[PDB]
């Protein structure tokens, strides 16, 4: 018995929930693991996320480490499990709400997020390669902060994979699946072309620029920083509808405000420029995750 299995895992603490499935801190052969638990009626969601997590060549330091998909029968009902590495800090949302970061801290968070997304989006051609994956629900609540102060992306149930040979998407995607606040303009107004996989990669970039805005607010220089806020906190209610978002992002064409103090620091200037270049209404004009990783790597080298 070498491989990690459900019957050997002991749940210790409930830590949160996804759209479906509750996340627990568990102990497996003396080590901490995260267990995402789904009910029998949530099999499709569980299966889909296990399917994404099992994608060939997916493992990357900035992608949540998958361990196993399993079942657990308690004698009354069956639970469907997704076991992964456990990241004590939780999500970027929790971390940024609790702490401010330095210039170095900010670049580590932004660069690691961009590196994970670049790896996700990257297609390695051939049967022994890797299909391109688009997240479709990227947000600060879906990005985990590791002990070393770097990020890893989780919550892949809404993801879509591209097959280069057939030039097709592995599923028939439903429209407007993600978090309304982070939905790209083309997703909000339904102009998105669901037949082109590049559309999904471009909508993930938009959401990442919003996440960078959340990080940059918390970068403290000389003890000066902004308070924690979700993007569009100044324009929409909590739990905004698609129409509330669409009126702001598409009709009025507003983006989160870029403060005057971000022009005073080079790291903040580079971050502010990436943001504007992720926020174009035209998806084709946005930066790629690979290009962002390259720009931030250069900035990390220099600092
Ligand atoms: N691997 C992990 N390791 C640790 C933790 C964790 C650690 C601490 C806390 C804060 C408690 O006060 C919460 C959660 N979560 C995950 C995880 O994959 N979570 C996860 C996966 N899919 C959807 C939503 C998720 N959550 C993101 C974090 O917030 C809850 C939702």
XYZ file of C-alpha atoms and ligand atoms in Angstrom:
334
model
C 0.000 0.000 0.000
C 1.944 3.008 -1.343
C -0.541 5.311 -3.183
C -2.800 7.701 -1.162
C -6.408 6.315 -0.672
C -9.547 7.655 1.191
C -9.839 4.854 3.863
C -6.407 5.892 5.316
C -7.306 9.647 5.544
C -8.671 11.235 8.752
C -10.624 14.519 8.492
C -9.499 16.992 11.173
C -11.001 20.401 10.279
C -13.579 21.954 7.897
C -11.870 24.895 6.112
C -14.350 26.047 3.456
C -16.332 25.254 0.331
C -16.216 25.534 -3.457
C -19.340 25.915 -5.707
C -20.006 22.233 -4.883
C -18.030 20.214 -2.355
C -16.704 21.065 1.086
C -12.948 21.414 1.724
C -11.385 19.757 4.809
C -7.892 19.554 6.296
C -7.082 15.880 6.664
C -4.167 13.729 7.753
C -2.719 11.046 5.472
C 0.263 8.905 6.624
C 1.330 11.616 9.080
C 0.976 14.459 6.519
C -1.557 17.273 5.975
C -3.838 17.028 2.866
C -6.848 18.954 1.553
C -9.937 16.878 0.853
C -12.741 18.263 -1.294
C -15.884 16.254 -0.556
C -18.859 15.903 -2.928
C -22.211 14.088 -2.482
C -23.342 11.240 -4.848
C -25.695 13.731 -6.650
C -22.577 15.928 -7.367
C -20.727 13.122 -9.294
C -20.580 15.151 -12.547
C -18.784 18.080 -10.829
C -16.450 15.712 -8.912
C -15.667 13.703 -12.099
C -15.011 16.793 -14.191
C -12.558 18.269 -11.642
C -10.779 14.843 -11.234
C -10.607 14.658 -15.060
C -8.899 18.135 -15.249
C -6.515 17.408 -12.325
C -5.450 14.190 -14.068
C -4.499 15.979 -17.338
C -1.116 14.764 -18.723
C 1.857 17.101 -17.850
C -0.315 19.376 -15.617
C 1.901 19.306 -12.448
C 3.639 22.646 -11.927
C 4.722 24.454 -8.735
C 2.018 27.121 -9.366
C -0.803 24.582 -9.937
C -2.397 22.865 -6.894
C -0.771 19.407 -6.547
C -3.279 16.606 -7.189
C -3.018 13.422 -5.126
C -6.045 11.193 -5.760
C -9.741 10.932 -6.662
C -11.503 8.341 -4.482
C -14.839 7.254 -2.900
C -15.572 6.725 0.829
C -18.552 4.714 2.026
C -19.403 5.437 5.671
C -22.018 2.595 5.679
C -25.022 4.935 5.070
C -23.879 7.116 2.135
C -20.951 7.414 -0.309
C -18.774 10.571 -0.486
C -16.738 11.485 -3.556
C -13.253 12.795 -2.706
C -10.572 14.911 -4.370
C -7.353 14.800 -2.335
C -4.679 17.445 -2.943
C -1.764 19.180 -1.182
C -2.816 21.388 1.768
C -1.855 25.109 1.757
C -2.303 26.474 5.322
C -2.668 30.183 4.202
C -5.807 29.429 2.191
C -6.637 31.682 -0.738
C -5.138 34.984 -1.981
C -8.403 36.701 -0.959
C -7.830 35.669 2.760
C -4.080 36.486 2.624
C -4.584 40.000 1.094
C -7.402 40.753 3.541
C -5.135 39.845 6.517
C -1.810 41.234 5.265
C -0.104 43.940 3.263
C 2.909 42.909 1.131
C 6.270 44.443 0.164
C 7.351 45.134 -3.473
C 9.162 41.697 -3.426
C 6.064 40.035 -1.858
C 3.819 41.560 -4.576
C 6.063 40.397 -7.488
C 6.255 36.862 -6.024
C 2.400 36.658 -5.809
C 1.838 38.201 -9.314
C 4.696 36.265 -11.046
C 3.715 32.871 -9.564
C -0.005 33.427 -10.544
C 1.079 34.358 -14.121
C 3.451 31.329 -14.261
C 0.638 28.950 -13.221
C -1.741 30.412 -15.786
C 0.982 30.337 -18.523
C 1.491 26.612 -17.759
C -2.297 26.033 -17.762
C -2.751 27.811 -21.151
C 0.340 26.122 -22.715
C -0.246 23.419 -25.342
C 2.580 20.827 -25.833
C 1.704 19.167 -29.218
C 1.540 15.339 -29.588
C -0.014 12.311 -27.748
C 2.813 12.520 -25.088
C 2.233 16.306 -24.762
C -0.264 18.513 -22.934
C -3.561 20.112 -23.999
C -4.123 23.852 -23.425
C -6.533 24.430 -20.497
C -8.548 27.584 -19.746
C -9.684 28.002 -16.069
C -13.014 29.979 -16.653
C -13.383 30.975 -12.967
C -10.108 32.623 -12.006
C -10.379 34.910 -8.944
C -8.509 35.667 -5.711
C -10.741 33.064 -3.903
C -9.354 30.298 -6.278
C -5.663 31.127 -5.947
C -3.844 29.566 -2.965
C -0.835 31.050 -1.129
C 1.944 28.539 -0.291
C 4.344 28.781 2.708
C 7.089 30.300 0.491
C 4.851 33.305 -0.358
C 4.083 32.091 -3.925
C 0.704 31.051 -5.436
C -0.962 28.007 -6.921
C -4.222 27.834 -8.843
C -7.020 25.479 -7.679
C -10.787 24.800 -8.336
C -10.752 23.364 -11.893
C -14.391 22.125 -12.180
C -15.295 24.829 -14.756
C -12.085 24.371 -16.870
C -12.073 23.588 -20.633
C -9.312 21.684 -22.555
C -8.270 22.130 -26.180
C -7.383 19.291 -28.606
C -4.960 20.677 -31.283
C -5.490 17.682 -33.707
C -9.312 18.196 -33.943
C -9.096 22.003 -33.130
C -12.012 21.375 -30.668
C -12.956 21.945 -26.983
C -13.411 18.725 -24.917
C -16.898 19.803 -23.700
C -19.967 21.736 -25.001
C -19.505 24.809 -22.735
C -22.408 26.538 -20.955
C -22.438 30.342 -21.140
C -21.546 32.537 -18.097
C -20.411 29.745 -15.727
C -18.050 31.693 -13.429
C -18.068 34.419 -10.791
C -19.990 37.422 -12.230
C -17.581 40.052 -10.797
C -14.581 38.621 -12.774
C -16.428 37.826 -16.041
C -14.777 39.338 -19.114
C -16.754 41.975 -21.114
C -17.336 39.437 -24.019
C -18.661 36.909 -21.444
C -20.954 39.573 -19.812
C -22.538 40.690 -23.109
C -22.470 37.111 -24.629
C -20.411 38.257 -27.710
C -17.773 35.567 -26.800
C -17.140 33.081 -29.615
C -17.412 29.685 -27.746
C -16.011 27.890 -30.884
C -12.504 29.511 -30.610
C -10.436 28.207 -27.621
C -8.316 31.402 -27.639
C -11.517 33.219 -26.428
C -11.332 31.282 -23.099
C -7.619 32.027 -22.636
C -8.324 35.750 -23.238
C -11.208 35.839 -20.668
C -8.841 34.219 -18.041
C -6.299 37.057 -18.728
C -8.978 39.721 -17.994
C -9.750 38.036 -14.607
C -5.974 37.832 -13.820
C -5.552 41.610 -14.390
C -8.375 42.124 -11.830
C -6.499 39.810 -9.355
C -3.270 41.889 -9.934
C -5.254 45.051 -9.061
C -6.283 43.362 -5.755
C -2.587 42.490 -4.997
C -1.159 45.960 -5.939
C -3.574 47.754 -3.499
C -1.946 45.796 -0.632
C 1.677 46.606 -1.662
C 2.962 48.749 1.264
C 5.780 51.254 0.478
C 6.819 53.591 3.314
C 3.824 52.229 5.251
C 1.435 53.551 2.542
C -1.103 51.132 0.978
C -4.853 51.000 0.039
C -7.437 48.978 2.059
C -8.459 45.534 0.789
C -11.266 45.578 -1.845
C -12.704 43.194 -4.451
C -12.647 44.647 -8.052
C -15.725 46.886 -8.774
C -16.439 47.299 -4.970
C -17.101 51.015 -5.820
C -19.632 50.219 -8.631
C -21.660 47.064 -8.039
C -23.414 45.460 -5.002
C -22.047 42.369 -3.188
C -23.088 39.293 -5.238
C -23.589 41.353 -8.488
C -25.893 40.032 -11.230
C -24.784 39.677 -14.864
C -26.847 42.825 -15.822
C -25.308 44.933 -12.998
C -21.783 43.840 -14.192
C -22.630 44.253 -17.952
C -23.937 47.870 -17.424
C -20.641 48.795 -15.667
C -18.003 46.852 -17.655
C -19.631 46.807 -21.116
C -21.950 49.820 -21.375
C -20.191 52.393 -19.147
C -16.755 50.798 -19.947
C -15.381 51.216 -16.402
C -12.419 49.251 -14.958
C -11.074 49.292 -11.321
C -9.350 52.638 -10.565
C -5.568 52.764 -10.839
C -4.388 55.074 -7.958
C -1.966 57.987 -8.545
C 0.614 56.487 -6.095
C 1.212 53.433 -8.432
C 3.142 55.796 -10.806
C 5.723 56.614 -8.021
C 7.305 53.088 -7.917
C 8.718 51.031 -10.911
C 7.289 47.676 -9.677
C 3.862 49.399 -9.247
C 4.194 51.102 -12.697
C 4.889 47.723 -14.443
C 1.934 46.139 -12.535
C -0.413 49.053 -13.509
C 0.590 48.742 -17.210
C -0.090 44.894 -17.186
C -3.544 45.633 -15.658
C -4.583 48.084 -18.430
C -3.267 45.593 -21.013
C -5.413 42.732 -19.439
C -8.516 44.983 -19.333
C -9.003 45.822 -23.064
C -12.632 45.213 -24.143
C -11.066 43.549 -27.239
C -9.856 40.095 -26.098
C -7.398 39.857 -29.094
C -5.496 42.993 -27.796
C -4.819 41.586 -24.289
C -1.400 40.313 -23.133
C -0.783 36.528 -23.027
C -0.014 34.831 -19.659
C 3.407 33.866 -21.120
C 4.214 37.552 -21.967
C 3.155 38.645 -18.407
C 5.393 35.939 -16.797
C 8.310 37.258 -19.022
C 7.720 40.919 -17.971
C 7.420 40.038 -14.232
C 10.456 37.626 -14.362
C 12.569 40.592 -15.675
C 11.173 42.748 -12.819
C 11.930 40.005 -10.191
C 15.528 39.634 -11.555
C 16.069 43.457 -11.312
C 14.696 43.678 -7.680
N -5.594 22.728 -1.229
C -6.072 23.550 -0.296
N -5.324 23.726 0.819
C -5.804 24.499 1.796
C -7.052 25.144 1.696
C -7.610 26.032 2.753
C -6.823 26.520 3.804
C -7.315 27.475 4.692
C -8.586 27.999 4.542
C -9.038 29.187 5.357
C -9.765 28.810 6.630
O -10.195 29.969 7.316
C -9.393 27.479 3.535
C -8.924 26.498 2.674
N -7.805 24.987 0.587
C -7.347 24.206 -0.416
C -8.247 24.121 -1.622
O -7.920 23.464 -2.599
N -9.385 24.854 -1.553
C -10.458 25.007 -2.482
C -10.602 24.191 -3.619
N -11.597 24.332 -4.502
C -12.493 25.307 -4.290
C -12.435 26.195 -3.228
C -11.389 26.050 -2.307
N -11.192 26.994 -1.262
C -10.084 27.943 -1.423
C -9.746 28.559 -0.086
O -10.915 29.147 0.555
C -12.001 28.211 0.668
C -12.369 27.642 -0.678
